[PDB]
Design a protein around this ligand. Structure first.
Ligand code: FES
Ligand code: FES
Ligand code: FES
Ligand SMILES: [Fe+3]
Ligand SMILES: [Fe+3]
Ligand SMILES: [Fe+3]
Lengths: 192, 446, 446, 446, 192, 192
């Protein structure tokens, strides 16, 4: 993509297009779909320890940002463009999992209900690190609790996965640029 | 409802009618008597440092543009075109010499003045009095050590006087530390609570921490972690509570410089705070240098809250009686190493931001307490804030304001609500002052 | 609107202003004059049989905790903490000795008493008068053969008197059958209708059945299936209608023991009902034993409805003028075989539950009729309920109440709305009684 | 708010209080004084040409059924059953001899009469006075060259008189062209704006076009494309503005027959319009034949707008103060070739329909201007409409009405708002007339 | 999964994880995706008779439950935990289909519009019954009617499918535990 | 499908069922999924020029209709049943793309955020034109802007794709019958 011509496209977005339009390896697309469907299943049943053990690499960065609304023509104002809703290493994810599982987490009773919808899976091996798998996918995440609370989250995920212990592919980076600037879901206390 | 006569808050601030968190007619009245009257947080110097830098901010339900002028001052204006009333600026921050309206193209300066009108000569000739068509300006804009507040009411006290006895507590961190920076952009989330629910919780509620935050205390390994599940009461002399004439108040937890931060940051922070305290002893005295590195949970009346040392800065932006838009910034000490500043900012959002696991613990508390204020059998019920009443002092030789010399109590609730009631029942600042001439006597009865 | 003077329901209940289904100011007034005054359904013995068992229930827009005490009685309390007003219980049912608030940890007994406060000694000393801080208790709780109702108004008539002439009709099934059990949990769905729309439909509307439910009648093969598409009017003497002083009423369809149940259950039910009737003839007489196995469509004023024999039990929980939360239980005879009870419960939900194909037929009827009450040209229009007027009797030697001796009419609408209007225009029970001293004369004019 | 006294629109229509776009109490008042009083667009002959053809339409927040009678006339009725108030018709258009209610099966004729009631003989006997139970009829229904309008107020002026001086401008296209057809079905979209925002924009706002629609002008290559980004002011004598006693008004852009249509249609349209103009010169004179092929942006007070030549027809259906349901039809000349009619209709929707790229440019303008009318500091602010004031004329020898002889100005805003204010402050038509006896003098001051 | 460690996970949910994490048969995943996409297509166009004939086995149980909200720590209260929104055999499904198709079903005029989104498909053959196929999938179901009514449903489906007449795989069990306790969609009168 | 028996089914809908129930070519389903995922990715990052160049055929008809609500039993009233929200040729799509990219499109600042979820992909080659590929898919399209505006669109798409320049498959027809009669999303200014 020529971002001088395609005026609305970011350099970052153009780089990611190129990664997937080049690759096609249909078996890889299928492996990636399985990986993500299984991950989502673990999360949906709130098997957060299982998720950490089976899906998350020790070197993970799990990052969700919220970008400040700036003028499309802005070129002078240079301060921090985004904040980190999540920017977690493995230990920080573990703290979050322990908080979920603590029997004095009052907000988890009655038990929450999660349903995740994973679509638009794309997969490409890294050019330089032959053991690093790039996976892109979109998620709709539905959270229901306490009779009449329903929150629906929508995001695109840019992942890196790498084979780890036992040859199991695990998440080493997830990046989400959350599309809604002001959240209307009470909080973003869900694993996208 | 007759707000001149209706007792919404009882004498000494001991209770409040539950309807105050639910009643929409009262919410509309608060727009006039609370938000249009009092000082409201806008931004920090650090977010608009250069000429032409601007941000948008809410003041009550109104939106304003806050702009750094060429002479270094800051002016703020309604984000509303003077022609047909379109919103002028649709972004959160930027740099510009002016603002053009996308409806008919009117151009306003960074100073609010109407500078151009398309085809003025051909269309208006000489008939448009542009001098009278500048953006509606916020009457008062003042700074507290780089923190910029606005007030629509020209009659308000100066910001410093408005902070009252709270200012003394804030100065060690806000002034003597070398100053603070606000790290943006903020997290923004809507909660289904009245703005007063988080405001009251931050101003004065240490009692909830061990029970509400049991899981976050246990899981995060923060410095206050012994409190989990009410396993341990803070010891004797672990802190105090204060409040002030114009409603601002805070809790003080001695020495808790690492605050909510998880064990990953505790050693580094406790070293940094302790080192600065050692230098400050000589400059401001041992007590105030200790306050510098003590955790303050404060609300600057009405709707700006903070946790010093944790480095949390909040605005509870009102939407309606059961809806509030929560803005969450990090505050850092300017002279901290940049890498620590970065990690502190991330840790603030980790704990109390949009996916803040600590703040998540508070959601149901504030939402259901607010929503219950709409329920028929609860509207006329009394919310209680009597903990510690009869033990508060005023005019103490060491700690100013109305002070409860205990870490846990409801002193700051009482002062908050005393000020609230005085505003709601008054038509202007003069009437608030008359209603507040015995404010500390009222708070220290029995 | 002046509710003392405004004629919302005309004389004899013959018409109602359409605005009653749409007006939010009236809805707020009903919270006081209908829901805070009258008996409201809570639960059944079968759902809280053991000490410490509890459920949550709505009473109007308020939520209550309903708890089986150690002495076997039932008490009910607002689900609102006495401290800062958080919702106490976040679940629908359970078993506990008490309830701890998740905000600051106050502990209340199953009997509503404030039993503990964290760190009471250190924090409150001896100053907290816990005896005055028990949960706000529902003044009146009474049982009708295991069905538990509550009333916030201490001045209400006893539940039995409140049921008036309706009780005579209910007793064969509720008492003489050996008793009923409520099968939970209920289905729960929100509909965009006023609570009065389903209440009026269940109290008195046989006329709609053949047309509204044409597809369900034709498709399900139930016992009333000849009615589909108004293909056949019920014969002479197929049933009757009744109403009562305090607004409760019902239709009676002779012998229709299998009700809405599809042909799969008809033979089994008709056998079971007939067998019990044969035994009841000797005990309560032929007429009342026949009533036992006759289909009753009843509303217990204001907002609890049921279909006996079909085994449907409904609560129309008010949210706002055009929003209602519908709770659907099954009722079964205790001495039915367990397998039949199970199949009956599933069939209730199949027909009138959240995916109830019969109840789906009614949705647009009730939603649009309600929403039209907000529309400008309809607010002051008259909803008609004159069918059968001038043919009702009172004091009949066999059938008590104001009775229309025909299966299809609007007798029960008229009594419902007469009671409604008497409440809306009255400040207390004494005034309702004064307004109702010629209730049956009014209903039987012309 | 006292609508008899409150100055919502200043003298000569020069400004309006911003609250008029946000205040819900005023919206409710407008239902009475604007929508229940004035003529409202229903449909076109072309959509209900045959006996029994009907459409549903909104009139304010009310829904009506509009039906072609056997005698060729059109009658309109509330879409509300006379029994228990269910919505009668759930579709947008069709053909029928009558309408049966799906609740209890009452059958109404196409003429509104109650024709049948199920089981009338058995149930009501002779007691139901069906003659008094016909659907509530719209008092006034009149046609302007096939365009059908309704009015709930029997006292309204005839439609032709109501159009006032606007009719003269519309007649070349509506009458002398051989007539127009409305091409359905309409696009339907909800916008978060007050109905007055698009109404005012269409009645009188040429000033916004170059700036608001810069991207659509540049991208579409339409005939008005030189305006993009305010690159060029229309020349001297490029058009005019007009307004009228009862609030209707329009802009005239000389010769702009292809309107918003993209270059693909420009040559064909400019040929077709020019050819017809050459024929019309002889029949109606050069000026009026030129008006025929000149672009008119018009609002027929209160809430029906159109762009002649572009072929756009809009209804701004009110929902609440910040919600409007926008209906978009295409209008075509009957004698155009069918293929051109088809392409024109698609081009209307392409430009101003639900995915209309031009209309998308206006969304934020109208939504934020409306929503800002709710904000506390803006409610009492003044929206300005003074452009061209002091240069308008009345009684011109060539162009009737209050006329500004310039393409761009706010003449039509002033007349719109003068009429609006006269209605809002009046209880009936007689009072509006008294309030309007010097209407043109007021508009032409200074 | 160890549900003593993963404290939020139900025994039922743990059993279903094990079923799919074991199997991988990529061709089966594809067959299952086809089956479900075709089923959804039939339902979306309201070909309810075709759905019964082509997709539903004579021995079907079609079950959707709503579970009462109970304390996570609850251990004494033992009464019926759930009610059946649906619990249908083939004949009962047929009654529902006839109700949909009846020309006096007034609520079906004007015609409703359905759009279904099926995601997260997993498939595994039963261990013991070699002809029984377990399929799990999630659905978003959008129903639009009468101008401005829109209802969106979200659920996970646990299915059993078996080859029937003509060797065509048909649904023999569907189980849904509906995630929202209080429905805000007017009714649940849709085939999930 | 017999539409005399399946009373709610349109002739058009029955024809489309037959097209896909006949075909099964699993590789084609995969090619179609790739095509649509890549298209959606380009649109989501607002690479509208790239979308035109890589995904849209010169002979395209891009059509979205809104059908008037009529009685299910209606048989006399015969006027235009639908209007065209979109009915675009390539040049008309290009005009729309230029409008999106124009730096005076004020409504595009701050930049919008799009996330698309494509599901239920089916693919079949045309019987008569061996180079024409029929693809059906459903889309959820999430648009977020200006802090707190969120609009979600739901549709089924009937596409025809044909190999064009460079042998790249491009869209030659898209047809959507939009399921919501009255839009509650401000406008339909999105490429479904
Ligand atoms: S509304 Fe801003 S220039 Fe007109
Ligand atoms: S609100 Fe319940 S203990 Fe404080
Ligand atoms: S409401 Fe129309 S027939 Fe009863
Ligand atoms: Fe807290
Ligand atoms: Fe019914
Ligand atoms: Fe415009």
């Amino acid at each position: 993509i020529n971002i001088q011509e395609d005026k609305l496209v970011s350099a970052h977005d153009a780089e990611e297009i190129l990664r997937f339009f080049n690759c096609h390896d249909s078996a890889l697309q299928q492996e990636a779909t399985t990986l993500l469907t299984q991950e989502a299943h673990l999360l949906d049943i709130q098997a957060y320890r299982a998720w950490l053990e089976h899906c998350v690499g020790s070197e993970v960065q799990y990052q969700v940002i919220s970008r400040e609304l700036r003028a499309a023509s802005e070129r002078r104002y240079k301060l921090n463009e985004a904040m980190n809703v999540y920017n977690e290493n493995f230990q920080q994810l573990k703290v979050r999992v322990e908080h979920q599982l603590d029997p004095q987490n009052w907000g988890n009773s009655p038990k929450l209900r999660f349903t995740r919808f994973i679509t638009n899976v794309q997969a490409a091996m890294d050019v330089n690190d032959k053991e690093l798998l790039h996976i892109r996918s979109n998620v709709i995440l539905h959270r229901a609790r306490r009779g009449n609370q329903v929150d629906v989250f929508y995001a695109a995920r840019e992942d890196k996965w790498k084979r780890g212990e036992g040859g199991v592919r695990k998440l080493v980076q997830r990046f989400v640029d959350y599309p809604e600037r002001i959240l209307q879901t009470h909080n973003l206390m869900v694993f996208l | 409802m007759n707000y001149n006569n209706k007792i919404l808050v009882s004498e000494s601030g001991l209770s409040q009618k539950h309807l105050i968190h639910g009643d929409e007619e009262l919410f509309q009245h608060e727009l006039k008597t609370i938000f249009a009257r009092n000082w409201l947080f806008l931004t920090h110097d650090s977010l608009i440092p250069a000429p032409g830098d601007y941000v948008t901010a809410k003041m009550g339900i109104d939106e304003v543009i806050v702009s750094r002028q060429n002479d270094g001052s800051i002016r703020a204006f309604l984000n509303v075109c003077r022609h047909r009333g379109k919103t002028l600026v649709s972004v959160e921050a930027g740099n510009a010499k002016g603002f053009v309206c996308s409806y008919h193209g009117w151009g306003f300066g960074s100073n609010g003045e109407l500078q151009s009108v398309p085809f003025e000569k051909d269309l208006y000739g000489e008939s448009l009095n542009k001098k009278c068509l500048g953006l509606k300006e916020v009457a008062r804009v003042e700074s507290f050590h780089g923190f910029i507040y606005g007030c629509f009411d020209q009659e308000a006290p100066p910001l410093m006087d408005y902070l009252g006895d709270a200012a003394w507590y804030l100065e060690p961190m806000f002034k003597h530390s070398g100053g603070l920076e606000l790290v943006g952009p903020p997290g923004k989330v809507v909660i289904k609570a009245n703005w007063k629910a988080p405001a009251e919780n931050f101003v004065g509620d240490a009692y909830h921490v061990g029970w509400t935050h049991a899981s976050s205390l246990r899981s995060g390994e923060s410095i206050f972690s012994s409190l989990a599940g009410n396993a341990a009461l803070p010891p004797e002399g672990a802190g105090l509570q204060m409040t002030s004439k114009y409603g601002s108040g805070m809790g003080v937890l001695w020495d808790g410089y690492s605050g909510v931060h998880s064990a990953d940051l505790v050693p580094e922070l406790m070293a940094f705070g302790g080192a600065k305290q050692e230098r400050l002893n000589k400059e401001i005295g041992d007590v105030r240098a200790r306050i510098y590195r003590s955790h303050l949970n404060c609300t600057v009346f009405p709707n700006n809250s903070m946790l010093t040392c944790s480095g949390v800065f909040k605005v509870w932006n009102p939407i309606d009686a059961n809806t509030t838009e929560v803005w969450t910034y990090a505050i850092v000490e300017k002279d901290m190493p940049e890498d620590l500043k970065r990690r502190l900012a991330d840790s603030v959002q980790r704990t109390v931001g949009p996916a803040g696991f600590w703040e998540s613990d508070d959601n149901d508390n504030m939402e259901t307490a607010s929503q219950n204020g709409k329920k028929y059998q609860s509207r006329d019920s009394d919310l209680l804030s009597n903990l510690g009443f009869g033990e508060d002092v005023y005019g103490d030789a060491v700690y100013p304001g109305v002070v409860g010399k205990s870490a846990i109590g409801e002193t700051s609730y009482r002062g908050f609500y005393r000020a609230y009631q005085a505003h709601v029942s008054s038509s202007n600042w003069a009437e608030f002052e008359h209603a507040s001439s015995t404010w500390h006597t009222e708070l220290t009865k029995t």
